[PDB]
Amino acid sequence: RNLRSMAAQAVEQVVEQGQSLSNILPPLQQKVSDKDKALLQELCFGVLRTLSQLDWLINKLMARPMTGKQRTVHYLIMVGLYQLLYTRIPPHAALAETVEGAIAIKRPQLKGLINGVLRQFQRQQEELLAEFNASDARYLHPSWLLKRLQKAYPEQWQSIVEANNQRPPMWLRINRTHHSRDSWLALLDEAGMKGFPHADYPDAVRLETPAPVHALPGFEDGWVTVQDASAQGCMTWLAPQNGEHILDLCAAPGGKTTHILEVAPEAQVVAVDIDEQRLSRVYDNLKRLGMKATVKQGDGRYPSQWCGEQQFDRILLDAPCSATGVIRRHPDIKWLRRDRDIPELAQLQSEILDAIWPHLKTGGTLVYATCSVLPEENSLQIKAFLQRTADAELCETGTPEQPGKQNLPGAEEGDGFFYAKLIK
Asked: What are phi and psi of 201, to 5 degrees?
């Protein structure tokens, strides 16, 4: 099959139809071998990551970009440009494969145009790149988001977009019930792989180079879990204890659920999430680590539908959010989210907070977390909740003036992420 055609179609579905790469890729990757799967992923993630550049180039090369009935051709050309710019595939081979891709997208009559456009890029590559690197498109973020970052982070915005554009570090979480972090690191070294600790995340190991999960010592035995460092940081704030009834709301994929049980093996945790698609994930993590918990389908807007009038000792709310802190792992975020989504998400977060707070027992601890870097979902949010919720009190994360703690992405750091700890 033609991988370039597959990548073009996948990227089109994300950008034009609003589909998540996490949903489209699976069925596609399953058809192909390991080497082809890797290249397909490289193309899809790469075109999404660099779309600002590829689109800029198309606009400089084509007076009339391919549209409507020919929209897939537009993405196929971008897949071609991506190979020329970001891989070492022999250009003649990249061109040949991309051009041949016209047959699988049912537009074989466009081969000549695809070849022509890519050759024209080859002819004009030098000047086009020099021009590109003087433009704002070089930051690879859509304007609405670039501007939001520039406003929220007047000093750090360049470093933030740069970190968003890097290949993401593979962070692992070592299950302390089986090994200490340092002991497991020794196993990693013996296995021929290199890992690094982090001073702020005691269970974390950052791999020097990403590896498949089957290559990680004891993955199937529950010795280690793949989980970004920032998310691991939730435990520092949740501080779960044995015997407690803890709610992990919006639990998929179940990484924090199990972390709670690594910290507190005798906690009575209830993990809840929207559908039976995100729930299969949680069941897997619980099984793998030989843990037990009650897993429920549920909407955080209407808690009584799944927990009646029950109250909990601690609540970890991983709030639905823009996921702007995780762009390095999911470049589709840049193209799936729109400016208008931020106020909507902020209001949902506001609604969920309202609906779940009553279910916190008195003296309980709620940890509000997001994987956003936008103040409206984060610090500004917590302040609004405090203002309208008399029995809430911030605890240690930030100040009443600037609630919470904000993480920013970096090569040896976790994703952009935010924490706020509240007590009633």
From this structure: -130, 90
Instruction: Count other Cβ atoms within 10 Å, centred on residue 122.
Output: 13
What Å distances lie between residue 383 and 94, 312, 403, 421, CA to CA? 52, 23, 6, 12
- In 3-state terms, what secondary structure has residue 269? strand
Residue 298 annotated as binding? no
- Is 229 among the annotated ligand-binding positions? no
Instruction: Please provide residue 367's backbone torsions phi and psi, each rounded to the nearest 5 degrees.
Output: -115, 115
Of 3.30.70.1230, 1.10.10.10, 1.10.287.730, 3.40.50.300, which CATH number belongs to 142-168?
Answer: 1.10.287.730
- Any bridge partners for residue 318, and if so which? 369
Residues 89, 285: Cα–Cα separation, whole Å? 38
- Alpha-carbon distance of 343 to 315, in angstroms, equals 24
Cis, peptide link before residue 343, omega less than 30° from 0? no
Residue 371 is a catalytic residue: yes
C-alpha distances out from residue 221 to 35, 147, 253, 285, 287, Å: 27, 45, 18, 11, 10
Q: Where exactly are the structural domains of the chain?
A: 1-141, 142-168, 169-226, 227-424
Q: What does DSSP say about strands 204-207 and 268-273: parallel, antiparallel, or unpaired? A: unpaired
Tokens of 361: 């027992």
93 is in an annotated binding site: no
Method for structure elucidation:
X-ray
Radius of gyration from C-alpha coordinates of the chain: 23
Any idea how long the chain is? 424
What DSSP letter does each residue of 118-159 carry, written as one string? HHHHHHHHHHHHHHHTTSGGGG-S-HHHHHHHHHH-TTTHHH
76 vs 111: CA distance, rounded Å:
11
Q: Per the annotation, does 318 bind a ligand?
A: yes
Fold of 1-141: N-utilizing Substance Protein B Homolog; Chain A (1.10.940)
The CATH number corresponding to 169-226 among 3.20.20.60, 1.10.1740.10, 3.40.1620.10, 3.30.70.1170 equals: 3.30.70.1170
Comparing C-alpha atoms, which of 191, 231, 190, 230 is closest to residue 214? 191
Check the annotation: does 321 bind a ligand.
no
Kindly list the strands in the beta sheet with 224-226, ordered across the sheet, starting from the edge strand earlier in the chain: 195-196, 204-207, 170-174, 224-226
